[PDB]
A paper describes a structure:
To further investigate the molecular mechanism of the activation of USP46 by WDR48 and WDR20, we prepared, crystallized and determined the structure of the USP46-WDR48-WDR20 complex at 3.1 Å resolution. The tip of the fingers subdomain of USP46 is stabilized by a Zn2+ coordinated by four conserved Cys residues; and the active site assumes a catalytically conducive conformation. The USP46-WDR20 interface is mediated by both hydrophobic and hydrophilic interactions, and involves two loops at the base of the palm subdomain of USP46 and several top surface loops of WDR20. Specifically, Thr347 and Ser348 of USP46 form hydrogen bonds with Glu534 and Asn41 of WDR20, respectively; Glu279 and Asp293 of USP46 form salt bridges with Lys259 and Arg516 of WDR20, respectively. Intriguingly, there is only a salt bridge interaction between Arg243 of WDR48 and Asp386 of WDR20 via the side faces of their WDR domains. Conversely, mutations of the residues of WDR20 involved in the hydrophilic interactions with USP46 (N41A, E534A, and N41A/E534A) also have insignificant impacts on its binding with USP46, whereas those involved in the hydrophobic interactions (F262A, W306A, and F262A/W306A) significantly impair or completely abolish its binding with USP46. These results indicate that the hydrophobic interactions at the USP46-WDR20 interface play an important role while the hydrophilic interactions acts a minor role, and that WDR20 and WDR48 can bind to USP46 independently, and the WDR20-WDR48 interaction has an insignificant role in the formation of the complex.
The USP domain consists of three subdomains named as fingers, palm, and thumb. The catalytic center comprised of a conserved triad (Cys, Asp, and His) is located at the interface of the palm and thumb subdomains, and the fingers subdomain is involved in the binding of Ub. USP1 is responsible for deubiquitination of proteins mainly involved in DNA damage repairing, whereas USP12 and USP46 for deubiquitination of proteins mainly involved in cell development and cellular signaling.
Numbering used by the authors:
A (entry chain B): 13 to 332, 344 to 451, 454 to 478, 501 to 559
B (entry chain C): 11 to 321, 362 to 391, 509 to 568
C (entry chain A): 35 to 65, 77 to 88, 97 to 142, 164 to 366
Write the structure that this text describes.
Amino acid sequence: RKVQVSYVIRDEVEKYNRNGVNALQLDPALNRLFTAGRDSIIRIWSVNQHKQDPYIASMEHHTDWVNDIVLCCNGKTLISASSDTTVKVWNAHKGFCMSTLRTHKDYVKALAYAKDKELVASAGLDRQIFLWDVNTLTALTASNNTVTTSSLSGNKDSIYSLAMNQLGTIIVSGSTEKVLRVWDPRTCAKLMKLKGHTDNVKALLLNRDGTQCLSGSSDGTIRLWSLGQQRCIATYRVHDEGVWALQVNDAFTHVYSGGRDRKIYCTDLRNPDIRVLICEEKAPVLKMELDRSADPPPAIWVATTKSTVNKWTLKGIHNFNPITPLCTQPDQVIKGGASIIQCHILNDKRHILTKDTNNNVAYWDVLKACKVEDLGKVDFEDEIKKRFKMVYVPNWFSVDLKTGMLTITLDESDCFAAWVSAKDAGFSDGSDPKLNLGGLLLQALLEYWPRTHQKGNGYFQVPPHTPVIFGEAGGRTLFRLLCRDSGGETESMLLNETVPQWVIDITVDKNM
Amino acid sequence: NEIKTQFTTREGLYKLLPHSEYSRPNRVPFNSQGSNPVRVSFVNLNDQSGNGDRLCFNVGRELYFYIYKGVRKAADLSKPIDKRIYKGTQPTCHDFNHLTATAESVSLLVGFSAGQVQLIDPIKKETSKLFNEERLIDKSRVTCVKWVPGSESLFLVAHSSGNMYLYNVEHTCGTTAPHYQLLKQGESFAVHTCKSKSTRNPLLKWTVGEGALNEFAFSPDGKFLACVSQDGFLRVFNFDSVELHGTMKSYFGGLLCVCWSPDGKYIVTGGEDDLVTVWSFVDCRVIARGHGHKSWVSVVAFDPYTTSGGGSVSVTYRFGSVGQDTQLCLWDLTEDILFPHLGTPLCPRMEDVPLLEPLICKKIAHERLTVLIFLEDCIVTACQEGFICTWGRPGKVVSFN
Amino acid sequence: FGLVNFGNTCYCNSVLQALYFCRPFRENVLALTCLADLFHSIAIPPKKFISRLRKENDLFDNYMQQDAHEFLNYLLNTIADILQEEKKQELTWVHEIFQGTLTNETRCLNCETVSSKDEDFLDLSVDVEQNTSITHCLRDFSNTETLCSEQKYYCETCCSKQEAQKRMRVKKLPMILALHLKRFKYMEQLHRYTKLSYRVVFPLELRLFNTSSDAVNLDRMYDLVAVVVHCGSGPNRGHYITIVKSHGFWLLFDDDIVEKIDAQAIEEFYGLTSDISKNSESGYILFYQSRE
Ligand SMILES: [Zn+2]
């Protein structure tokens, strides 16, 4: 129950993915692709090749990896699951977040969809599975903010995959507990346990009737299950390493499999010996999405740990251990921004020297929350030595690179232990007093808040688009807003109840 | 720890029935001394009165004989039908003759830890013919005894010396050590015959490998005999032809129990590697292995009443094992395992053979289990403490008339 | 032959006899040095080796009962370092016969990258449960611990806190596997710890299941050579005995006395099952030798 203040150093848009992509959704009515990014940002793209700039809009509200997304209500509504222990309801057409569900106690790892009744299911590391009626989530208001909760009991370990059939009658959970578990979503009754796999299961598929099941597992095997006989039918072993993604055609005859070994095959379930290597991606495959616009699948979208999202056409697929691939160059390529992978705080505890996936070293400023200059592909260790400062300043913040952008975290334990003189820091009579870097930063983050009125500190200003985050330690996100959005009426009403006491002291009382 | 009293399967909820429990009349737990294992034998007397089922079990020195009522309330434990007390060597195994069995006479032979075998008629208590009483045929303890399928007089016994002996009720044993003459030499086994003009009782001496022969089991048809020894070799023979049909080496250790499938196409085997091993008869190859026990396996048995052979339904088998870990396991053999598409070739590696997982794995006793019998209405288990537990099948607990 | 039990010397005699009958070990002993002199005497008072142990190690200076596993582990590594120090004028023959290697693997559940951390061992300390076998106790030794919830593992490849699985698995099989059954476990109270008299069965043949698939000859066959039995109902209030196999016949060494015994009589040294906490004549240290 310890509140922490956090903010991200980034550009205003960041219209490309700053990290890898966990899930993919596809709206064929509008020809739009949805990418769930490991940078907490869901982006709407355009698969129509007549355009050259596929970017449409960015849906950002999550504060941690967005692990899975589901598109419902003929593309109107989008449901997202993320590592910030939240499940958010979105308006997929306009592109803004509608509601936030905080029932999970850990990473929400996967979602499941049932179109015939508009039912979505959320599950993750908290070992829990919740069932949500989509039509009741879209009608959530400030007065009627609660909703009936229906959860399934069963799993003995963390859940990594979840799948429902189209009818809304079979739901299967895959888990680091190697056994698959099946329920009836209407009565919540346990139907069967499917034993066989020897490792975690990250991929699950069900046919429309809910009678067969495809499962990809980290043991390197794909198993076709019979829910009628309650047993395994066939076991395909076309990969070397852990299978993580699965897709199937409309006839449930061919399975498209991907995973850690960067290979992507199209195997026939009836005859496994006919395997067709589609392509060998550059990064491990996390999620795949078939193009469902023809009797055979024309193309398939692939998401990897890299920030780029590719599309591979399967034109010559019916005419073809397969060492020769079908495709080498993708049909479409959605570009990806680089990810900051290494970070080093300097001795003055104000400037940060980073290095991204393109081996580009950059010089940042934590106090002003700005990028000073890009330094290109220079040596990273030697630049740290060349930027050495003969001074000691205590630690007053922490940095994490899970989103690939710079995320700074402030904690009450050591936020204010940063007394630095103003002259040598870079400010002006020239009185040169001792300034507290931590307390001076909290006043600039809440600069547009009318309760903290001089406008700011004077000495500096953080970017207005800087997202400020209030949360709990290893905990749930409490409230999120931009720096400029502190002046909104209902947004300032939340700042009266969400901001902890130790932040109110430095910003309002001028306690220092 | 607390023992389980029920378990669920796809068929339904199996429930333990304590009011159907059989043990000593005093009901004090038999001390789990090294001693010899408590065994159970059943027999039906043509169910002429509906109470045609008879139960026999041994507990250390005592050997009881009651009327088995199945899922109904057990018979009065204080009033047995027959009771035998052995001050000398102790009983270790027994079996009824299901053919020559009626309400007036029932043939029951009992093995002992001295090597002796004794024919007993418990319902009349009249006859008592001892076999190998002088310990001249073999001095080691007997392990498994059973009548020959379809015979009325012949029966086969197996001892810890790694030998088997065929007897006859009508014959008499020698006053001296019998002299043998060779009949058939084979791969790691030998069969001899008694060289005697007079009809000596040891009809033939069947030497089976090294180490102690832990158990043998005839095929359901009768034609074949499956033997397991302490050296870890499962040897199945043709009983009429007297020659080797197939062999199988355990992963390690040595095979304690063995049994046949109802149709006789498969054989499962428990041993000292905490593993049950499924073996195909027609192909003479290992098809599966099961890891679900914390200690050695004691008894394995197929369940004919939950087995679907042939069909357009798929072929599926059901068999159980009980181990020295006081746990009961149930296993399913399905077509994905049956029909998939120190030598290791006749002892495949762990990667070359499927690895089964049990449907259930429940602790059902405080002591090591030694009995697992599948009946029409119930499952029968027993521990070293001498409690014969009865597990009612789903729907077989109550009848309505 | 037999060794003289001067009093509380059982745990030194028991392992000494058990150590001898290791045919590869008794061979290369021909060339501390007090043990090589006592080995040549057999091929019997051990006063030259007993008194040398009291002055060498201060832990064994008292005249009380002690742990055979503590002396077995100390005796092996003490002979190993003097062999390595005398070889200055790296793989000693003491390590070539007894030293195995197990790796502590850490596996991130998201990216599935495995990092290793090897550990060399002479004895394999394995925990004990009631009504189990050594092959199941080895499975319990190689169980998979999961780091999750508030104790997530930071993965450098993922740049975030993810779930992870720690797991121990033998990497290199030793020529002679020494299985120490941890029967002496803390009492969880201020009272002296008790002796676990659980029935742990052990076969004569043995193969290991908890082997890393990276090795080649991981499923080699083993054979029981010797086993150090321990009588008594307490941690330091008992007596050590040794079952052992010179040739086909099995021998029993109770201190000075020697007696031949059948192989089926080992069943009495598995352990109690009624849990009456009696003598509990049970096996404590097991010696398995490779076939090839
Ligand atoms: Zn990772």
